[PDB]
Write a protein that binds this DNA or RNA. Structure first.
Lengths: 222, 185, 172, 159, 58, 51
RNA sequence: GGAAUACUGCCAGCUGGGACUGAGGACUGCGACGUAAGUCAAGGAUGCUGGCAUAAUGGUUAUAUGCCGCCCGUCUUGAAA
RNA sequence: AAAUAUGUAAGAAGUCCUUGUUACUUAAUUGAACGUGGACAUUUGAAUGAAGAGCUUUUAGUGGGCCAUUUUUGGUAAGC
RNA sequence: GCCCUGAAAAUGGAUGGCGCUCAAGCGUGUUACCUAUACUCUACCGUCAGGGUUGAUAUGAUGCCCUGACGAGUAGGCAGG
């Protein structure tokens, strides 16, 4: 064959329609998030207007980042971190919220600082600190064709597809979280903000659950 | 630092190249690494893997053992390949024509096979005929039948052939072997 | 512990198959952020009822923005501090601006003389004294005289550099 | 010296019971034991014959031998740094069926029960045991239930 | 010349360096200790079905 | 050969997420919302202000 | 009755200044802008200037300065002792 | 009668229907062990992780320890 | 609560020293600021691991190249020089 006119044009033709699928699916997604908050903010308004109170569903996933170093770790907590893929100091992974999973967090609090993240925080983490996994071999995410080569047979033919499952907790979420290398973050830019880092967030420290306050801490690292 | 869930800088533990400093043997690796890397068949990989073994892991195959593989159902015309040396067995009379491929054919193997109509074949000759190993049968000689393996890991109530120079009476049948003399093992 | 913000918290427990919607309790709490706010409510319900953090649920969290954050209100507050050799109660009255300001200036003042940390102090109730001359402690009534006035002696100015040229005075 | 006897340090361990003394009832004998059944060990001090060592108590094993008036069990003892297959032969009064296992039995048919229904209607298997999922969004009511203010109680000794 | 009597420190740390092996049961476990009267059955039971399976298929 | 992160260096942000082009055209980070007239019920306000 | 403001959060909002590095060494990957040729900030630098042109840069050596740094080997729970 | 800790199970060496052999057992092809023919497949039936899992031989050195949080023994106490 | 009495030892000698008292002391918050061989990004050295590379003129396929992660350490083991 000549390989100058036929295959390359078709290869671009196949590539160009793939972007359209990604764009069309994103248009489906972008409509979904806006309806999400617009229906939970309005429902919060209507509860008070009806003389009631609205309790939203608890956050379905948390971002857990290690605070302590590696020395002087008891054996039971240490095994928890290894199974959580949290190896280094200032390393983070998204953890599905579940009573089975939640018990490890309350057993690993003195060495982690976790909380409920927001879509903005996930948006930068996937884009900036995006690392794949292909026969180990941690490589940057970058292109939108590496993901479909590793996750396409679990759907998810785009990075925007992946970032939707990592926040909305899709059906096949465990390996989608497991496909991403643990997020290796730097020290906070504005500082930890507390004199001593190893007090609980209630006691004026850093470790333990902090709900929505984790967004501010992660943005400095990322 | 980095917490280690495994041992860092660990070796694969397998032989990537033969320790034998044989100029001809390395040529066998030369041909097969080309096939194993490029031919999408496991026959090339297993032959290459089995070719880096030592002599202990490369036991001599009796010529009668091949005969068993030929009245194996459905393997009448299947060619046989084996890495190592093929010996002769003085307890077989019937031998099918067939075709045998190996590294070193002993004098008995070199005579019994050819007189039955077969031909001794080297690993290079099968490559030009069966690059991927079509209609090819592999077999390995007995490994746990070596003299030294019967002494491995002996202990009380295991009966694993304690190492002794002279056998017979007065040699390792006293107290610790029979109930009348002390105890039994 | 920080720039304090009051909060209200509502808790409905877990509705069992027998007694749904049990009581929808409420409490007024004094904290700095919502994260600590959701933790003090449980710490205060456990001391009065037979429910705990596991057997409970936060219904709503709200902030009471002051209706008159500009008028100088009067406050009388009761405190129960776990001191070194037991616990005690007092009636201390202060007026900064409002509740969130009064609570803030309470804790430094409370920890200044009694060395009671934030975790060893109980806030009983915060209320505005409606009618004047209903206060007992003299150091607060002292600033309610008609058209009060006093000077500020011994003024000290903030130097910019390390050297001065005129031996500055302390007038005002 | 030091005492390391066969049944040493067993003073609250082999007590029969409180208000349950006397001869054992007849239900423990009338149960059928078959080879390959998960059981539990609870030593009975009433009859010392065929009674396990103090180490084995509450341990769970598999039935492999069933003789006339005793049952053989295997215990995966952890000694040193490894597991060894310890075989124990115990009488029928120091043993009882482990109903942790039996719960799995009807679970097998329970999944199989709606397995037929799953293929009858279509797909929708979802037979993997989901853990305790977080609660979803719910609304509370105030009509007839008004919030009640609460304050910490002032200190008082009442003694 | 008093010495250290006994100490169990570092024994679990030493033991766990190799993973603590699972006792690795097999299919058709060893029949040691089985009732001899049933074992006499077990030899003859398979012997009878040995020819039964062989005679059936031809 | 080099890791060029998204957000900055817009070009690498265009090979990813083709929706990012139309996102900037119609803002979508400063979109105006619709206002309503549902003032909270009077049975809630006194609970908020109650001692 | 009416806003604004404060607090928090978001923008695939626009930018100004400073600091370190520029590794790799045909073309061959996903892109963006233009129907169009082509171009680009897209798989990691080029363009233009100048002064010296040889002890000027730089190495070694001696001294000075700011800071740090206790003689080795040895048994030993533990040493410079 | 706690808290910590601890044993076992979460299944393809699995379940269901017909059926054989046995010198055991049973009044009784009635019971017990395993196979013969057919059905259940990738949510095949808890969570997370897995620089792969398992296995063998050989041997250096090691067999004076000490300290700290937590519990506790002897002694008033001790850098006992 | 602070402070004070209670409170007496031996080469002159201590919150590290100077010193400091609406203090540089005491208790409590607010920020901003300085850094380790800690974390982040990059180049290089080595090890390990996973892979591509017989096409000939023209040099090594016990070679060439690509990617990723690691690097402490007495007794001790092995390997390359």
């Amino acid at each position: 064959a000549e390989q100058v006119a036929a295959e390359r044009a078709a290869r671009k033709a196949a590539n160009k329609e793939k972007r359209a699928i990604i764009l069309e699916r994103n248009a489906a997604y972008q409509k979904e998030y806006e309806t999400a908050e617009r229906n939970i903010i309005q429902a919060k308004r209507d509860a008070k207007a009806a003389g009631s109170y609205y309790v939203e569903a608890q956050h379905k996933l948390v971002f857990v980042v290690r605070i302590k170093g590696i020395n002087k770790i008891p054996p039971k907590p240490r095994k928890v971190l290894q199974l959580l893929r949290l190896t280094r100091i200032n390393s983070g992974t998204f953890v599905k919220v579940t009573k089975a999973t939640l018990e490890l967090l309350k057993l690993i609090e003195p060495y982690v600082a976790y909380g409920y993240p927001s879509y903005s925080t996930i948006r930068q983490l996937v884009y900036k600190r995006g690392f794949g996994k292909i026969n180990k071999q941690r490589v940057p995410l970058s292109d939108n064709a590496i993901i479909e080569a590793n996750l396409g047979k679990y759907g998810i033919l785009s990075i925007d597809d992946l970032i939707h499952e990592i926040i909305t907790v899709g059906p096949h979420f465990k390996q989608a979280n497991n496909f991403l290398w643990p997020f290796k973050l730097s020290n906070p830019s504005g500082g930890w903000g507390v004199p001593r880092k190893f007090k609980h967030f209630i006691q004026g420290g850093s470790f333990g659950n902090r709900e929505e306050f984790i967004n501010k801490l992660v943005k400095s690292m990322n | 630092g980095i917490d280690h869930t495994s041992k860092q800088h660990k070796r694969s533990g397998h032989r990537t190249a033969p320790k034998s400093d044989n100029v001809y043997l390395k040529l066998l690796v030369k041909l097969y690494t080309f096939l194993a890397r490029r031919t999408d068949a496991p026959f090339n990989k297993v032959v290459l893997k089995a070719l880096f073994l030592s002599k202990i892991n490369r036991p001599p195959v009796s010529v009668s053992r091949i005969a068993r593989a030929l009245k194996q159902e459905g393997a009448a015309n299947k060619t046989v390949v084996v890495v190592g040396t093929v010996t002769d067995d003085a307890r077989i009379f019937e031998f099918p024509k067939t075709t045998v491929a190996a590294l070193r054919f002993t004098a008995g193997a070199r005579a019994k096979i050819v007189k039955a109509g077969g031909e001794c074949i080297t690993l290079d000759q099968l490559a030009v005929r069966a690059p991927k190993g079509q209609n090819t049968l592999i077999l390995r000689g007995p490994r746990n039948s070596r003299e030294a393996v019967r002494h491995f890991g002996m202990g009380p109530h295991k009966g694993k052939a304690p190492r002794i120079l002279s056998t017979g009476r007065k040699f390792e049948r006293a107290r610790g072997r029979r109930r009348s003399k002390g105890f039994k093992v | 512990m920080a720039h304090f913000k009051e909060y209200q918290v509502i808790g409905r427990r877990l509705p069992t198959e027998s007694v749904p919607e049990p009581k929808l309790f409420r409490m007024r709490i004094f904290a700095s952020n919502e994260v600590i706010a959701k933790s003090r409510y449980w710490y205060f319900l456990q001391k009065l009822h037979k429910v705990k953090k596991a057997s409970g649920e936060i219904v709503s969290i709200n902030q009471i923005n002051e209706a008159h954050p500009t008028k100088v209100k009067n406050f009388g507050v009761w405190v129960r501090y776990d001191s070194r050799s037991g616990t005690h109660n007092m009636y201390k009255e202060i007026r900064d601006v409002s509740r969130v300001a009064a609570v803030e200036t309470l804790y430094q003042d409370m920890a200044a003389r009694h060395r009671a940390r934030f975790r060893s102090i109980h806030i009983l109730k915060v209320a505005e004294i409606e009618k004047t001359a209903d206060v007992k402690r003299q150091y607060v009534k002292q600033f309610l005289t008609k058209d009060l006035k006093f000077p500020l002696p011994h003024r000290v100015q903030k130097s910019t550099k390390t050297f001065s040229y005129k031996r500055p005075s302390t007038f005002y | 010296g030091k005492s390391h006897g066969y049944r040493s340090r067993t003073r609250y361990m082999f007590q029969r019971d409180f208000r349950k003394h006397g001869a054992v009832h007849l239900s423990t004998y009338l149960k059928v034991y078959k080879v390959g059944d998960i059981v539990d060990i609870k030593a009975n001090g009433s009859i010392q014959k065929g009674m396990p060592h103090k180490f084995y108590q509450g341990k769970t094993g598999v039935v492999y031998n069933v003789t006339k008036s005793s049952v053989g069990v295997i215990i995966n003892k952890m000694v040193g740094n490894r597991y060894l297959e310890k075989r124990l032969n115990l009488r029928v009064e120091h043993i009882k069926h482990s109903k942790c296992r039996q719960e799995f039995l009807e679970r097998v048919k329970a999944n199989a029960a709606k397995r037929a229904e799953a293929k009858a209607q279509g797909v929708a298997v979802q037979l993997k045991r989901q853990p305790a999922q977080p609660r979803e969004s719910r609304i509370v009511s105030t009509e007839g239930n008004v919030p009640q203010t609460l304050a910490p109680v002032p200190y008082e000794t009442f003694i | 010349a008093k010495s250290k009597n006994h100490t169990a420190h570092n024994q679990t740390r030493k033991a766990h360096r190799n993973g603590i092996k699972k006792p690795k049961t097999y299919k058709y476990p060893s029949l040691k200790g089985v009732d001899p009267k049933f074992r006499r059955n077990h030899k003859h039971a398979l012997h009878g079905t040995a020819k039964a399976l062989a005679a059936a298929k031809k | 050969v080099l890791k060029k992160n998204p957000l900055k260096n817009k070009q690498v942000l265009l090979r990813l997420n083709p929706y990012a082009k139309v996102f900037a055209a119609e803002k979508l980070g400063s979109k105006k919302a619709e206002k309503t007239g549902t003032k909270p019920a009077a049975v809630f306000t006194e609970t908020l202000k109650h001692d």
